Structure 1
């Protein structure tokens, strides 16, 4: 195809520039990683995974029978940070709404010891969860790089993680966020508001009509009065610019 890589690089940098943030999107094609955006050096820097960890929390919870995909986690009736969270949901609904109370309950069912062992076993990020089973993904000590995140998405997309195949398919079904003319986008968003500066994530893959999977991971700095939806907007623009969707 005819567009220069100079032009692709410049167009993708501009999407980050126009959102007035600093960020990177890593794309993996087969075994080859490509890094785009306006702060390339973020690629191998460690950030908290924030809600991207829901993906692994779900794998672990499901593998270890801490929940089923149809179980309804009841709202306890206490005020939640966001009103969309004050309702009863499955893991899948909770994943789409990035509902931390559901995933905090799941983590507590799993428990500190099984959680530390499982995160070590899958080798996620720096693999350190500390001593608090319900908050290690927001504010430390667990960290991961944008490169390690596309490599996780690539593992999940191909069923290579060390979990039952059915566990992995179950979670993957939870992650479908967009269909764009025959392509399907599976991804999990992330927003660490605790840490300073804030981190935004969108990690996932595109499944093309012909079955090919192209993993990506977007990582940027969120600032106050950014809508969470630039994460998606920058991502879809980047994938469209590259002819992936």
Structure 2
């Protein structure tokens, strides 16, 4: 079998090849393993950016601000991406990472309730500030890569403080890949309105035997880098380690 030294070298190279700095944290049962080319990122705070959609969806569904089939209508105004100029359910919006639909959901929850639920769940630094519709994009909400893989571990195992049914509905929103009997559930995140920019892919692998292996990738995104590098490094890392 392959040495630690070699796994670590391989996964560090994935980051080096992308000309970025990043970490990926894997959790197995209770044990966290940190890999990549900038390990000290593991316990630094960054904005969650679209990572926070997993929790905004939980809070909105639990608090009856939406249902899993409600169609959020496009209001007709020009959007950053053409693929967002359409009507969609929270699940469609999770996959397209459609920030406008999730800003509407935040605004239905409202500042006061949003701040209470973010506190109740203990996400990151728990601080949402005064602006209900952009706190996960530009601050002040922040979360370390450790707290993210721990958040994915809780979601994955249904340990967040929400109805089981709420958690199952949100996890169904997150299936992003199947590869050999393994299912990968994750949400990406790119905070562009912060400097330096932060990229995330947080989730877990469900192996064919039902075991769940949570992960959070966290890297510096750079002007002109592609978004699928978060995916590419993540899948290379998980396959290097035999998780998929």
**TM interval, short-chain normalised:** over 0.9
- For residue 82 of structure 1, report the CA deviation from its aligned partner: 0.7
Output aligned runs, 1:29-44, within 5 Å: 29-44=28-43
Instruction: Provide structure 1 residue ranges, at least 5 long, that are not aligned to the other structure.
Output: none
Deviation per residue, 1:97-137 (Å, 9 max, x gap): 00000000000000000000000000000000000100100
TM-score normalized by the length of structure 1: 0.99
Deviation at 1:225, TM superposition (A): 1.3
Unaligned runs of 5+ in 2: none
Q: Distance in 1 between matches of 2:117 and 2:108?
A: 14
Task: Give a deviation string over 1:7-36, Cα, whole Å, max 9, x none.
Answer: 000000000000000000000000000000
List 4+ stretches of structure 1 deviating above 4 A.
none
Distance apart, 1:161 and its partner CA: 0.1
Aligned-pair distance for 1:224?
1.2
TM-score (normalizing by structure 2): 1.00
Tell me how many residue pairs correspond in the alignment: 244
1:186 & 1:5 partners in 2: Cα distance?
A: 26
Partner of 2:200, secondary structure, is: strand
Q: 1:144-183 CA distances to partner (integer Å, 9 max, x unpaired)? A: 0000000000000000000000000000000000000000
Q: Secondary structure at the match of 1:119?
A: helix
Task: Please list the CA deviations of residues 37-76 of structure 1 after superposition, one character each: whole Å capped at 9, or x if unmatched.
Answer: 0000000000000000000000000000000000000000
Give distance in 1, aligned partners of 2:137 and 2:59: 18
